[model samples]
Target: SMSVKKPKRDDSKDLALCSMILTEMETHEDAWPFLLPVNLKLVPGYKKVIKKPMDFSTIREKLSSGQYPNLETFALDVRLVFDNCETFNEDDSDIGRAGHNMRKYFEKKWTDTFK
Candidate 1:
């Protein structure tokens, strides 16, 4: 295996953006147990997902049971939303971009179930 050494991340910006996204998610009053900020707010126009009148308990159950996102449409939409935004090819080479990808990936994967 190759050695793994890279510079540390400046958590200030990433964390701040993450926190901002989380707050926006919370403001929707949707208890989405899986709607972490990565895919939700940081993805540009995805912050409106929670604005709909949906039940969080149902979302949580579907996510836990692994039944909701099994549909092709849902999965494809998620991939499209997340797979193209990553700008970093190597680990830790770009913390800002990586952090952005993580937020988007986690958010999309986690939120697709409710779609």
Candidate 2:
């Protein structure tokens, strides 16, 4: 009989993985099926509900450790905002224009901070 052996888990790699997963899920809630579940922790005496975002520490730690983890998580964040444009406002005109300008600026390196 052949024995099946369990694969060894790397703690450091696992931490980086956890960070990536959390970041992606937070950025892409609609892709929840591909991500781990999230929850909100309501603190006492808080009038508003506090939603939990992803833990970026692990990814940042990895990056600091010389691992350039792809910013798929960051890109997903951008994709998600465009995915659900209704949440920001019902007026599609402004949103559409804003998206166009935003993309153009990003692509053309035209980002400017107005004082």
- Number of the top TM-score candidate: 2
Cα lDDT tens digits, model 2, 74-105, are 33443443333333334456645554444343
lDDT of each: 0.39, 0.38
Worst 10 residues of 2 by lDDT: 106-115
Give a tens-digit lDDT track for model 1, residues 27-61. Answer: 44322322333345455544444333222233334
> What ranges in model 1 sit over 4 Å off?
1-4, 32-106, 109-115
How does model 2 score by TM-score? 0.27
Show the lowest summed lDDT stretch of 10 residues, model 1: 29-38
Clashes of each: 3, 0
Backbone steric clashes in candidate 2, count: 0
